[PDB]
Amino acid sequence: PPPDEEEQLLAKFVFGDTTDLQENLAKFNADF
Amino acid sequence: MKIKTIKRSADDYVPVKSTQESQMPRNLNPELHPFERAREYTKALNATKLER
Amino acid sequence: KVQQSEIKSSVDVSTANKALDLSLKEFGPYHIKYAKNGTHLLITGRKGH
Amino acid sequence: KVENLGFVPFEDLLGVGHQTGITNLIVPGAGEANYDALELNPFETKKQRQEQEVRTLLNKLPADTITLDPNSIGSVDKRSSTIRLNAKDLAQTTMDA
Amino acid sequence: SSLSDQLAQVASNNATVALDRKRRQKLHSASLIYNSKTAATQDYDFIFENASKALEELSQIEPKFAIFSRTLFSESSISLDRNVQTKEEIKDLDNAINAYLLLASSKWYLAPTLHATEWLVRRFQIHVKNTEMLLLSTLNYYQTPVFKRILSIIKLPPLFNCLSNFVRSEKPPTALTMIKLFNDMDFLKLYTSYLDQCIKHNATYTNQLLFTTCCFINVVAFNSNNDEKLNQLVPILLEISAKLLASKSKDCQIAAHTILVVFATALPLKKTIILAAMETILSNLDAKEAKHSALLTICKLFQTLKGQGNVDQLPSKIFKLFDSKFDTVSILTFLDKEDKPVCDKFITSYTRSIARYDRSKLNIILSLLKKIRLERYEVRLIITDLIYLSEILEDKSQLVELFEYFISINEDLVLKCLKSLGLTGXXXXXX
């Protein structure tokens, strides 16, 4: 039973997930 | 290498505001509170001294 | 075989900075007694400190 | 040559006392991560401390209390009988005498 | 060493982790906008409510901040602290903050920007942890009160120790104390890294580049006495002028021209170094407003250096680069201006390269000599090359017209150098 992305997005806010932000913070490095 | 330590994070315990009371973390383990019957006897003896 | 040189790289900067390596050469072997809560430290130099 | 070693009670470090000074080696799992705020606070202000030492002075344990087991401080005297004694049973003990 | 000096090293490391409520009181009272009492009695979400309104206003102004809504100003960026995260990700947090400050160094005269950076001060402790890039970003606004506010919040690094008397000062820092900051040898290299990162991220504007030129010119002028110090200062401001010339903007080219003129006027350089100064100016010059400034800079750079071979022939690589980037009509209309700057050494070095390389257009030097007034030895070196041109070129009558001007004015000079090389009567036979 894999999860939907909607309940995945709801899980990330309700568990205090910082892995999504840390991946989104190291993604950009002089993108201009 | 699965290495991880005690991350206190300094934000749950000491509050951000200067108006909030400090939070009170609580571990009810018997080992962390050593003297049970001895200490409650002294609370009982001080209660009888206070009521007199 | 895990050493303190590579623990400090993989441990968060709170307890990394708490890894206090002092250097008090001029006195004897220092005796350590922390307080009952981990907030204050007491050194006892064998000569004078 | 190390002189003594002592752990920080609520973080995970051991403080090793050597001849040239103090080192703190990091360990993963020495200290407990759930401290009790009514006994020992790493984050204690001045007004919380000076109330607590007065309160601990009120709640101090007398020096007679130190025995092999702290659970044996509110118990019954061992040389007494395990069962209690009635006034009828005391007079029956007088009938033994 | 001793004990207490090691403790200040620990105290400087752990000046951002809150241990007591007093330490939280003395760290949360750092406030860009609110006062000390209001800063101590407000929560992280209340700052973030104004922060999300601030960055939404900034995303309306320029859409480069739409990235920072999802990485630094997300609602997940509240619970995390710098002092709970390890070293492999605090470097990513550092340059993300540095990328924001570079993209928001221009936008500082607007109250939405000050509200946006206020939460970055409080939530990510940038007034203690990374104090350098914050102070470099706002350094051009030192007259403004927001710099006086920033000094009242920040803890100064050892390099900005000249501003140590201007923290919590009712008078703002002045022009003289900013040059005394920039007179430090190491601080010029740090601003070089700031400027190179500024050019690479393509956000360079007028006001910070006007101020950087206003301090780079003064730090050469304040070090004009010590020749040893300007020797030590040569590889910084030339590397800056190399990177500033490499920018494609309309502003960095003129700002690199301002550095290259006054530095060479205060310090004569080797000919090959100023020859490289020609090719770097001449390479990426396409702005219309910067073409007039570039011609005056090459004019001033040629008259700075003195020596034998000062006004000799340019290389053919530089000459054809100058022919493409500057028409002969364009430099003639530049000489038409009645201000008429000192282009004497450049023109006689230009026309010797004209007589050597193209060997076809001698009507320009007829118009060049009539326009400019030249000195004695520069005219002698022109006539000597045109005499050498008379030997080898299949002599058209415009060469006779050019020497007809040369005998119309100062005919003893052309007669004397003809006695040096050849016969006076042989000139009419050869032309």
XYZ file of C-alpha atoms in Angstrom, chain C residues 12-13 19 24 27 30 32 34-35 42 48-49:
12
model
C 25.551 18.510 14.834
C 27.238 21.810 15.644
C 33.437 19.034 22.594
C 46.338 23.968 30.663
C 49.784 22.459 36.217
C 43.348 17.950 36.364
C 37.024 16.832 36.708
C 30.711 18.132 36.642
C 27.688 19.430 38.484
C 35.017 22.078 38.010
C 47.312 24.870 42.001
C 44.348 25.349 39.695
